[PDB]
Design a protein around this ligand. Structure first.
Ligand SMILES: [Mg+2]
Ligand SMILES: [Mg+2]
Ligand SMILES: [Mg+2]
Length: 220
């Protein structure tokens, strides 16, 4: 039943026709929480097919699980990301309008005092408090799911103590909003919707040329 107060935000942006970002907040049979964010691309403008494909697979597989304790989480994420990459790759190869499509994926399994994060691509995971903002993941840039039948995701475990927020985001945010801008926005008093709306408007005010998507989660 480990979960944070969290919300998913996305915007096509003022310089894009479609939204090829995807993601969500999902719950398994014991109401554990999984945060998922995907930045799609490629194919004949089929980026949204890839990002939604991975998001839907993670949701379906997670909702089918009973209990994933912290010591099982790295292997669960790693093996399921590998399997989803395999499925997406061959799906793309079997459809001429999809061939070449792929997507980033950053996702987080939530536990009591920790989070387990898997990452493929240049979407990001951050933890933030009043004095620092730490990018947990490392941009693979760009390796994405679905363009090869093999993938090697990075796995991270981060203790949530003494941090205030967990942030997952596509590059539409951090390509145009600096880390310190994000941290100083979050140090203010306000709800998740307060910070989420302000952070989206800030990305738009910086004239992001990309889809902008993020999950903001409050750490107790
Ligand atoms: Mg994209
Ligand atoms: Mg990028
Ligand atoms: Mg992007």
């Amino acid at each position: 039943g480990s979960h944070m107060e969290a919300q998913f935000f996305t915007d096509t942006g003022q310089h894009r026709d479609k939204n090829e970002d995807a993601g969500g907040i999902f719950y398994n049979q014991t109401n554990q929480q999984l945060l998922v964010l995907c930045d799609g691309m490629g194919g004949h403008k089929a980026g949204e097919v890839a990002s939604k494909f991975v998001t839907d697979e993670l949701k379906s597989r997670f909702e089918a699980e009973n209990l994933i304790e912290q010591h099982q989480a790295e292997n669960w994420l790693r093996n399921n990301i590998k399997d989803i990459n395999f499925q997406l790759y061959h799906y793309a190869q079997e459809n001429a309008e999809y061939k070449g499509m792929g997507t980033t994926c950053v996702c987080a399994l939530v536990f009591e005092k920790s989070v387990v994060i898997a990452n493929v691509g240049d979407s990001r995971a951050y933890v933030i408090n009043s004095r620092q903002i730490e990018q947990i993941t490392s941009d693979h840039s760009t390796k994405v799911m679905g363009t090869d039948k093999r993938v090697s995701p990075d796995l991270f475990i981060k203790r949530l103590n003494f941090y205030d927020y967990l942030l997952l985001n596509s590059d539409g945010l951090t390509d145009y909003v600096k880390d310190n801008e994000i941290k100083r926005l979050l140090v203010k008093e306000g709800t998740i919707e307060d910070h989420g709306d302000q952070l989206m408007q800030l990305a738009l005010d910086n004239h992001s040329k990309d889809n902008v998507t993020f999950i903001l989660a409050a750490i107790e």
